[PDB]
Design a protein around this ligand. Sequence first.
Ligand SMILES: Nc1ncnc2c1ncn2[C@@H]1O[C@H](COP(=O)(O)OP(=O)(O)O)[C@@H](O)[C@H]1O
Ligand SMILES: Nc1ncnc2c1ncn2[C@@H]1O[C@H](COP(=O)(O)OP(=O)(O)O)[C@@H](O)[C@H]1O
Ligand SMILES: Nc1ncnc2c1ncn2[C@@H]1O[C@H](COP(=O)(O)OP(=O)(O)O)[C@@H](O)[C@H]1O
Ligand SMILES: Nc1ncnc2c1ncn2[C@@H]1O[C@H](COP(=O)(O)OP(=O)(O)O)[C@@H](O)[C@H]1O
Ligand SMILES: [Mg+2]
Ligand SMILES: [Mg+2]
Ligand SMILES: [Mg+2]
Ligand SMILES: [Mg+2]
Lengths: 369, 357, 369, 357
Amino acid sequence: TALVCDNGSGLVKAGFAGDDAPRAVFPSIVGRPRHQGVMVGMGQKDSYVGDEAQSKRGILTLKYPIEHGIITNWDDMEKIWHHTFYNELRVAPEEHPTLLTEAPLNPKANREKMTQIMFETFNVPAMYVAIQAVLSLYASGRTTGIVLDSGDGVTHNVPIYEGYALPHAIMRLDLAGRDLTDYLMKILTERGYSFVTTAEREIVRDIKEKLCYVALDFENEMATAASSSSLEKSYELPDGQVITIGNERFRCPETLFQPSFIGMESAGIHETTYNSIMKCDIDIRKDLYANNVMSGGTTMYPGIADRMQKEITALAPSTMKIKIIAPPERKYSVWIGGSILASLSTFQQMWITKQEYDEAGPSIVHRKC
Amino acid sequence: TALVCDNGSGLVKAGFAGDDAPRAVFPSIVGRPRKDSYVGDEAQSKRGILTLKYPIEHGIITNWDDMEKIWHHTFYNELRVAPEEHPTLLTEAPLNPKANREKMTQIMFETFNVPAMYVAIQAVLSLYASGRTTGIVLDSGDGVTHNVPIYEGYALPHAIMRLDLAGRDLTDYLMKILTERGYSFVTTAEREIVRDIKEKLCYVALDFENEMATAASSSSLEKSYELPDGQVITIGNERFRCPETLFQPSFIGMESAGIHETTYNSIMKCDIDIRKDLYANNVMSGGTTMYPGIADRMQKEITALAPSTMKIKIIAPPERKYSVWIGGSILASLSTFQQMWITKQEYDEAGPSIVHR
Amino acid sequence: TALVCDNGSGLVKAGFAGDDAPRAVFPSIVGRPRHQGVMVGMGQKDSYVGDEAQSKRGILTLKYPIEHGIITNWDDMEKIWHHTFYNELRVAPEEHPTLLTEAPLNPKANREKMTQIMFETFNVPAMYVAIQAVLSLYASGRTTGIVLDSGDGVTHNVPIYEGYALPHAIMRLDLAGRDLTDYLMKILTERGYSFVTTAEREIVRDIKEKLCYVALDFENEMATAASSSSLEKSYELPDGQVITIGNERFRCPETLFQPSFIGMESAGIHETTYNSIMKCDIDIRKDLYANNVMSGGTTMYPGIADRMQKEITALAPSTMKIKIIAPPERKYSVWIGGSILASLSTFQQMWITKQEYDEAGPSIVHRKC
Amino acid sequence: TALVCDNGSGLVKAGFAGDDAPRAVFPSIVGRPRKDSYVGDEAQSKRGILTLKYPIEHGIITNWDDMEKIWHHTFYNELRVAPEEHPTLLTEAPLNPKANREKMTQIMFETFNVPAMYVAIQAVLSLYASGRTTGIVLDSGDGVTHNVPIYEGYALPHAIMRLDLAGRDLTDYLMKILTERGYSFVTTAEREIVRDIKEKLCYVALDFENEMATAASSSSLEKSYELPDGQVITIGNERFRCPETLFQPSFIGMESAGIHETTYNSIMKCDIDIRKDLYANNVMSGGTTMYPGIADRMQKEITALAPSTMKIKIIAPPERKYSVWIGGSILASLSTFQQMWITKQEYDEAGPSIVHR
Ligand SMILES: Nc1ncnc2c1ncn2[C@@H]1O[C@H](COP(=O)(O)OP(=O)(O)O)[C@@H](O)[C@H]1O
Ligand SMILES: Nc1ncnc2c1ncn2[C@@H]1O[C@H](COP(=O)(O)OP(=O)(O)O)[C@@H](O)[C@H]1O
Ligand SMILES: Nc1ncnc2c1ncn2[C@@H]1O[C@H](COP(=O)(O)OP(=O)(O)O)[C@@H](O)[C@H]1O
Ligand SMILES: Nc1ncnc2c1ncn2[C@@H]1O[C@H](COP(=O)(O)OP(=O)(O)O)[C@@H](O)[C@H]1O
Ligand SMILES: [Mg+2]
Ligand SMILES: [Mg+2]
Ligand SMILES: [Mg+2]
Ligand SMILES: [Mg+2]
């Protein structure tokens, strides 16, 4: 079969084409010890990749090799791919073609270097690089719609009509889940809790998933929060301490709709989606309005579907119908579409073979993909 | 085999790798006239004409001329063992200067010419003896009381505590509270009796206020001890008040916090992700922690400090007095450690800097 | 003397009739603070207009009041007109009339609202609105020709023969310098440079004017860039960082000749020029061929005149001779023509007096101007 | 005249506007018995019978019962002035919650009944002292360290950094490295002696590596300090190791980067059109930035991280220990500021929300 690896900014999802769920889902971090070793002959590792780092994170400096959807550390990225191909999938990469994903509007050297590593280090026989937003449309089983893919470093919109993509209407916002974690780390010190280290960033990310939510009306909710203590929630720290947050629950996800909280000048995701639709042709805006697909993990906040529907409804004309498609499996929608695409007879002639790479070099990926 | 020696503040242990107990342990003291030099139990006698000083006091050497005398005594006179024929494993102290370890490597490689050398932290060896990997070691000896937290074999030097209350000050404090009973123990010949009476009839009470009331209302807690000259004395509340100084250092006028507060402070200075594993592994070391009920007392004290959800376990092995030497004997016998010995050739090629491992 | 004002989409040019150069030229932006003031007193204002907004653009949200030759915000436009009359020209509009310009095929409310403001807010004694393309012919001293005024929001062609304008052959293209700046903004992301805020858009605009140029043959130039790095130029940002672009230099201006780069169905400027000539009478097509008066800021790219000459020649019969008239001062040809027109004794009857407006309302801009 | 307050993490400075130095400077410590409470140096004198806890230890009040005692101790005892006649100007740390600044207005107008007041940011007042409106302020103090970028009077709260390493942590590290030489600095009385050693003998080396080699090979860097008991102690390389924790926070087990990289990171998080002006205006303030050579060291470190074409200028006025108070003293006396006092009449007609005016 063919591997379908979705190397995101926050998580790595590997598996085999033709399945329905990823086989390996682990954080994309590499940790190194920051203290000195004292015990004798313990076999203490100098680098931890994946779930090993998350279990020993109290004595490590966790670092993401991918930031904002761009691979900045290439020595660390080869370690993560080695962990995926050997310690997680337990396969020989020389026998399976690999399908990779990449966010739109990325540097041309980010995609070229992936081709060089896959073809010269792991010696795969074929490969292909796909766009994450296109793959999210395969999972939903539709050919017309606009995909809002919010992950850990990139929030991009891609409008597709009858299988045709419009590159001029593609947006890309660099506000995503990691920026929400950092913002929540800052608004927590107002209550007294100080989270600083990279290890404690993972703790705050845990608080964000369990408690944070999106309010339908931000102004009304803020008045309710201060009026009574009916919104406070208690979270227990790993060391037994109990912290309480009352209004930081809905202020952190509000950065998506009000990017001025983190000092950004760009508009919210609700306005960015409307802008992308208006850039398309007038005769295709009606179908794009009713087909709003959301993928990625950052689109999993409770109430984000109801909030997004209400905001776009005000901007759009009253005659038009607005529908937001939020499947419960939208976290793994990019991978599922990759498995569907890689399991198609027509796609079998679109792989980049080793022979083509041996004549045109790593620059063939732009012409083919 | 190898030679395992413990550089204790008051007692120096010696032996071979493989034994279940040190062969020769002596209260190492140096003596100089005020017959050229005296060291060990011999220097205890005729001490009036000798200069008795503590070399290792506060767990740091501070005197290299006296230190070489102790090592000379513990090999030629205590074991009848030639140092140049067998490797020697020494024990360092937590938070020790690199130059302090630097000189220790040079001294035996030149004066004694030992074939192989290795030095280990005393708190680490106490953790090795229990066979554990993660835990905070309360090493209470004769001069110092350390709190060394270790996680996955990675010590945290910024969270290592240090206290100056130990067994030596407990014995001296016992004298200051035994004079009001009519007994006079100024003379050093009677110091050993006070130390002996401390190791026999001293226990730590769970509730200090309740124990004080019991010892006064009724004579049930009173016990009798016979002095060597033939006189029998009875000690009342002194049985538990003297060990209470560890938890209440203000008894001897000190300002520092007790061992229960010192342990909690060291835990809170560690990373939040490793505090849970340190709560469940509280290892004991040294002979100052052989007071009955000390393990039960500190479990209650730390519990009131730690969060209610956290689980507290106090590990107090019955051989905690010799834990450091036992851990050294176990470590020197493992095949993994066999390749970590610092050979003489490595020292010659590089210098004293090899020991920085 | 009578004031002449050239209200452009990106630049404002003002001066007096009779002079040869505009008195004061400044960007047409109105920036407002987005951060929080913390210092006591200070010269902090509510809105900065013109150069004072370009100098403080780091902490302001720049907003162009005119887009695509249409005034969107009618309150920020009054600020710019007030800035021009009182702060830049330092004259009282009460004492002399003003000459205004407008793009062809514009909304009828654009002319009416401009007339109402001048006669009431500033109470000018008279006013007149002149077509920019007509004025550009005055500066060249010609009565027959076809103009290619390419500004910042609108590109248009107006054929004139012996002082007679042909309304049916008048063209208008909504592709201009601002769209080229946005296109260059997107294609700089392929090298890793991310410009997002409105302040950083001005930085990109400076790169376009200093580095971008027009290639004689697009296919030949593309191969040269890949063959060797003999077309790379470095640019120093205000931060001090050095950026390098070698292939984007001749691709951004190519959007004018190939509008499909930004996803548009319209033809290129060379094809639009040919279409305008064809719709005119056959007898006068010979004169228009050799009188291609090129003007506007966007037409200042090096080699654009040669490229237009080669393109039109291929479409035109070999017998006809194609001549491109590109004066070195074409950046202000619209203003210079207005200076010449307002200095004519025959033009004094064409002014719209205040008495006429009071008895006819703001609609008088159509019956005479 | 109007009073000026400089509420700090470890030292408060009060006085009157128009002067050149604070009239009264005392520590911000309130201690309860372990005669209701003791504030300032009086609590430090009776430390043995009081629990010394700081309301501010990290810039934020977080204790509103102790500051009704510290403010009371300042006006009624330190300055000997009834607060109900002069308006007071209090300062607050950057990134302060809107509720914290709202609570000061509530306390002042009711508990103290001051005739109008004002709350200003500490970083802003440090810029007023140097007569600037554009720059980035490194306000290193006793409990926290901030990097506050200001451009033409408009702050950038999204780029304000915060480091919890300050002078208090440097004194503790100096205490630890002094034990390696055998000096026993344990009690809080000896901490004040250690504080005086740091303030008179510790400096910042231009480069750490070459100074280490020079110190280890010569005694020219050694300096002798005379203890209050007449003892003479000597410090060698420890002089430039205590302040080096500012640039290498890993010395005390902290993960964050030094003050040189924190400032550069703060600059790079601002708009690209304002970074050139922030590079040339680096204003230092606070007590901890008084080390000899910190300004020269900071310029060298930021220069490497910045592009070559840029120009870096560190602006350290000689009296930067009281820059925050001096800025408040200058600001209150100006006739322009006389119109922006938060008059008590406003606080009566409306709520305490007018503190955001
Ligand atoms: N239930 C949830 N609520 C809020 N955020 C979530 C939730 N689940 C995941 N996330 C966020 O999604 C991010 C990664 O999700 P995902 O899109 O699956 O990976 P990637 O971003 O690598 O594509 C994480 O950083 C996490 O903060
Ligand atoms: N059973 C005991 N009860 C109380 N104290 C003891 C007991 N045994 C030894 N001690 C004291 O503990 C002190 C510390 O000795 P030890 O724990 O062997 O290590 P070190 O000599 O290195 O400090 C000795 O000075 C001794 O007086
Ligand atoms: N030398 C140049 N090269 C390329 N483009 C330029 C040059 N000079 C100006 N431009 C662009 O031309 C645009 C139009 O300017 P201009 O026609 O002078 O006034 P307006 O903006 O009113 O049309 C400007 O937005 C500017 O970006
Ligand atoms: N000359 C000096 N050298 C080094 N540190 C100093 C010096 N003077 C004062 N300090 C430190 O500054 C700290 C207090 O600084 P300051 O900013 O005035 O008050 P606070 O930080 O408490 O608001 C003290 O803890 C002291 O250690
Ligand atoms: Mg994704
Ligand atoms: Mg010991
Ligand atoms: Mg124009
Ligand atoms: Mg301060």
